[PDB]
Design a protein around this ligand. Structure first.
Ligand SMILES: CCCCCCCCCCCCC/C=C\[C@H](O)[C@H](N)CO
Ligand SMILES: CCCCCCCCCCCCC/C=C\[C@H](O)[C@H](N)CO
Lengths: 241, 30, 224, 273, 241, 273, 30
């Protein structure tokens, strides 16, 4: 018949290949598909939904595992005290590991885009105060005081009727994409740091609680993209199931 | 899609259509 | 303008003066089964006014050390009202739901709730609801921090005192039985614990109200 | 449409009262809407990054292990040269965690079977893979009369040949597969015994997989078969939060209650990295 | 020649495949086909022909194997007595196993459509009476009395010149298709039950027989469909033939 | 035409005398005509279920076992390395019950032969399958002169190669094959001996199948050959009731008279499930 | 149908035509 030749790529089973195979059921018609609400057409559609961030990931015991979702705030001596810090690296293990964005990003090697962190105040109605949230780009170490942190991009948050403010972390980088950061050589892709400072005080009249809590929600902007699919770093089994 | 048989479910995956509706889950407010 | 609200359906009415708008689940209002989706051959019954109205279920107390509660739908209403009677007299059932959660306190209290709806809530190891044992993992091995991906709202005691969610029919079949399948479960978890100083009122009840919308039944038989 | 990421428009400083993009009310339940060009001073950037790798087909059309069959010479599992395996996907963690992100899926499949000796050596031997739909006669021995495969599909292949593969349609009576089923499959009273059927969805039991070595007497080599699965023409609905703790049983969300662990890593203090 | 590549699907013999093969007889012309009456073009054409149903499948011995085709009817005390019950599952082993529809359905995994059962009275001309036939949808157990069975869909049958009535079992289901029902988990696809009740009595004058019999014929409607061909569950051999 | 199932039209209650869809007279011999929309209150349903899987081609175009040949080293069946097998389909129950639903069939065929050792191992060996039409010289040994296959079709193949397959036309002198023949094939007196030819239809005897191992001396391995058959371009006529009891002999409807069994299962009482 | 030889009986099964005559066996009444 027709003379052919075989190239040195035959008989190999490649997992990611797209190929044609012989069907097992000739002339088969599946069940019709009715309309079911809530269809996903892209993993990026649900990469922009805010989820609770675990900034206060100090405790570990079983009975206090719920305390990791908020961090406390109270009255001080008005000297610009520090509240909490963390690293703004979605793929690196840390506070971001508790969000849907953090879990999904583990399936993709490289990402690019702007993030967004929202803080909500859950105190009494008569408690007022202001806070400063600062984002230090790469190169600068952790700020030692407020007057050093105010140099980078920052936003001043005022308590009031509107109880939520959003700090947008703009995409500032040297490369078009960033790989996942880790300790050692791969610190080249570190995004920076986030700090929260007392602005004036936490003022409260008589007969009202002295301690309040803040809840932080994180998500991604409209230019967030990921590529180069890989497998996750965590396996949820310890043998046969 | 490339197909060599009489059944449509034996073809390749092909290229989908790039459409997004982020407002379905992020902004469901009336 | 989205601070006062009135919701009326059937012969019941709900008013609130501190609202947080209305969340429509997955951006789709409830509707009836179209002629192309149907599979039954018998004409269904639509009682309309007699089963689409607000029902009040039970009251649960909020304490400084509470864990959380969850309910199941439509298991709660099978012994309540004409909706209950029709559910046991018919085999196929479909409907939507409008859910309203009420919890109010003074200006000197503080705390926050997480109201969410999770379809097909399989629980690992009635109308009065149950109390969670391991709220961190939702009693099913999934973290609670990602619950916001589901239709949800918050009850912040300094901002509002109510939450409203509208959920259409969610299932892979046009009709299903109401006595063997629970489409979704409602969750109410205190994320920020309640706090007040001695002398204030220490009872902060939580009450649940809900109303079926666009109900349908088919397959008449004896009551089971 | 969304073929690429969004651009960034030039912005300047603004000092005016009444419009406040920054302040929000997350109690409503909707994500933010403030953008980069509304809280800092930005420039013009023309984004051309493709978003074609995050589609459902691009994320699920990759092969993964779902099955394992042993045909030993001396042992207690299958010492007669035949095996029966019920079709389940929940047997392995990597694929299960991926597929459990959603609630309803509708897809075709492409199955690939790789066979070799336990040491990895390849020997000349013949087999027969038989697909047994629910309600069909299941074989009980190596020379069972049901092996005539008069109607059921079957495949004959040798070890020395490249691994065999077939294409599989969507065979569910429902409109889609569901990995979670909050209910019971029978109208019974559910006293205690029915609780072992909690979550057992009949719409997911697709059949049985049967394998044997074609011959009358016992073979001469121990054999192992590995089943790999790939998805195509995938649709998904109603995403749910991802898994946190370890798996214990197939088709069960059970977890070890005494050993509960946080989602991520931990540090010593909140004011120190 | 032309360079090609081999995909990992070669050398396998797939039974259900449709392929091209080399003919053995070149230039062969078969015998012409004359017109023969009674051609079948679809297995569904002969799925709508009524066949005798074995409701009274009690006896087992050789000499009384013919008594399974009918069930008796006689005069009672007029208290709404029960006559006979059975399950309306075509694929499940039972009374339906004796029909052509029941045997054919064993070759297909899933079915959908409406059934139809016809009862014929074969008594004397002077015997009159009425019966009630009720179909209980899934969920309700076997009725304990007539007043409980009358709730479901039912038909009242009157003896007369027209000696046959048909009870139509409408397709009432939650899913588009049903798999074959069996004891255990697969009871999820059970279709329901059928019951026959005395309405008034079986009245007969003097000089006429006191016992009569009924013959039941079952078939399928015009919307009956089946899919996913499989092999039967019964093998009719006990070794070499 | 009937590409899909029928729909259901909206119906309402009817209370009128003279028209009675429900009452029938089955003594006539015709099936019912009352529909769902004429005995209960129905809605509008748009049926779109395909009926393409129940066609004759869709039901018969599946491979099945019909033959078995043994070529042992030591034994009494075929100790000379050659075998003769008359072409018959009635040798196995699964295919026979399927094909016996009708009376006349007209179809082509696709035959596939699978060969291996009795233990399932594959060894390098050469064979020759020869089709012997009725009236041709049948071989009687391994080195028979008739193996020159000057006119008869023949196939040379090795065990290590994929199984060989050929396409087969319709070779009957009649207009179709018939699995039942109520009569005798000769004009004789039918005293007793002819009764062994009752039902023997000459129009179904298509020939002989011959197999040998190409060589002069005895081979070194025992071999087994399996013949699989698949139908295409199928036409059928005059359906008949399906088989009930076990099979006893090829091309004979004989059954065990002492052990007669009902078609289905049995229960204890008629008023109890 | 797909064919590679000179004989029509060596081709594939192909797709038939969906026609039914249920009245031949169910309603043969004159
Ligand atoms: C040559 C024959 C082999 C083909 C056998 C495979 C065909 C059937 C595969 C089923 C596809 C996956 C869907 C199955 C159901 C669910 O995954 C699990 N039961 C989860 O409960
Ligand atoms: C390479 C040569 C092998 C080809 C031999 C097969 C060709 C002939 C097959 C006949 C097809 C089946 C029809 C035969 C007749 C009836 O089935 C039986 N005799 C029933 O009595």
């Amino acid at each position: 018949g027709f003379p052919t030749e075989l190239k040195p790529g035959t008989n190999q089973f490649l997992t990611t290949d797209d190929g044609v195979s012989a069907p097992i059921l000739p002339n088969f018609h599946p069940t019709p598909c009715i309309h079911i609400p809530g269809e996903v057409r892209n993993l990026l559609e649900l990469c922009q939904v805010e989820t609770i961030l675990e900034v206060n990931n100090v405790p570990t015991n079983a009975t206090s595992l719920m305390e990791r979702l908020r961090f406390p705030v109270s009255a001080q001596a008005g000297k610009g005290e520090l509240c909490a810090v963390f690293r703004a690296d979605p793929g690196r293990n840390g506070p971001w590991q508790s969000t849907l964005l953090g879990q999904l990003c583990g399936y993709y090697t490289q990402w690019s885009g702007s993030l967004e962190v929202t803080f909500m105040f859950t105190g009494s109605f008569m408690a007022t105060g202001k806070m400063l949230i600062a984002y230090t780009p790469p190169g600068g170490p952790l700020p030692k005081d407020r007057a050093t942190a105010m140099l980078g991009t920052h936003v001043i948050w005022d308590f009031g009727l509107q109880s939520s403010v959003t700090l947008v972390i703009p995409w500032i980088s040297n490369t078009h994409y960033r790989a996942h950061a880790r300790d050692g050589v791969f610190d080249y892709y570190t995004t920076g740091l986030v700090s929260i400072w007392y602005q004036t005080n936490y003022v409260v009249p008589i007969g009202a609680p002295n301690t309040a809590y803040i809840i932080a929600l994180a998500a991604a902007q409209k230019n967030f993209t990921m590529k180069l699919c890989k497998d996750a770093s965590d396996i949820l089994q310890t043998g046969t199931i | 899609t490339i197909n060599y048989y009489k059944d449509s479910y034996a073809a390749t995956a092909g290229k989908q259509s790039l459409k997004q509706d982020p407002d379905k889950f992020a902004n469901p407010v009336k | 303008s989205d601070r006062v609200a009135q919701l009326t359906i059937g012969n019941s009415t709900i008013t609130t003066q501190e609202a947080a708008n209305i969340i429509v689940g997955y951006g789709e209002w409830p509707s009836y089964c179209s002629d192309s989706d149907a599979t039954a051959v018998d004409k269904p019954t639509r009682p309309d006014v007699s089963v689409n109205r607000f029902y009040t279920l039970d009251t649960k107390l909020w304490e400084k050390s509470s864990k959380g509660w969850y309910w199941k739908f439509p298991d709660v209403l099978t012994e309540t009202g004409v909706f209950g009677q029709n559910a046991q007299f018919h085999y196929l059932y479909r409907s939507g739901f409008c859910i309203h959660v009420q919890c109010n306190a003074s200006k000197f209290h503080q705390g926050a709730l997480l109201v969410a709806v999770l379809p097909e809530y399989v629980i690992g190891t009635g109308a009065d609801g149950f109390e969670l044992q391991h709220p961190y993992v939702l009693d099913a091995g999934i973290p609670i921090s990602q619950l916001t991906v589901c239709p949800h709202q918050w009850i912040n005691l300094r901002t509002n005192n109510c939450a409203t969610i509208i959920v259409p029919y969610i299932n892979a079949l046009p009709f299903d039985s109401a006595l063997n399948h629970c489409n979704f479960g409602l969750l109410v978890v205190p994320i920020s614990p309640l706090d007040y100083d001695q002398g204030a009122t220490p009872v902060i009840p939580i009450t649940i109200t809900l109303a079926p919308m666009c109900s349908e039944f088919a397959g008449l038989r004896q009551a089971v | 449409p969304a073929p690429t990421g969004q651009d960034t428009q030039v912005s300047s400083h603004r000092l005016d009262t009444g419009k406040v993009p920054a302040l929000q009310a997350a109690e409503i339940g909707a994500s933010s809407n403030a953008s980069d060009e509304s809280m800092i001073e930005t420039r013009c950037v023309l984004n051309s990054h493709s978003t074609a790798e995050t589609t459902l087909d691009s994320f699920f059309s990759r092969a993964g292990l779902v099955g394992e069959i042993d045909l030993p010479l001396k042992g207690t599992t299958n010492p007669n040269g035949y095996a029966n395996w019920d079709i389940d996907i929940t047997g392995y963690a990597q694929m299960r965690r991926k597929v459990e992100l959603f609630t309803y899926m509708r897809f075709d499949a492409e199955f690939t079977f790789v066979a070799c000796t336990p040491t990895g050596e390849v020997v000349p031997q013949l087999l027969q893979y038989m697909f047994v739909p629910p309600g069909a006669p299941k074989p009980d021995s190596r020379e069972s009369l049901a092996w005539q495969t008069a109607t059921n599909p079957s495949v004959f292949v040798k070890l020395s040949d490249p691994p065999a593969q077939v294409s599989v349609p969507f065979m569910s009576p429902a409109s889609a597969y569901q990995w979670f089923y909050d209910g019971y499959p029978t109208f019974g009273e559910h006293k205690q015994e029915k609780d072992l059927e909690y979550g057992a969805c009949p719409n997911n039991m697709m059949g049985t997989f049967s394998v044997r070595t074609v011959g009358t007497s016992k073979s001469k080599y121990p054999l192992v078969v590995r089943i790999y699965m790939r998805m195509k023409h995938v649709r998904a609905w109603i995403p749910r939060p991802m898994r946190n703790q370890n798996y214990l049983f197939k088709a069960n969300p059970n977890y070890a209650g005494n050993s509960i662990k946080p989602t991520g890593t931990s540090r010593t203090a909140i004011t120190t990295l």
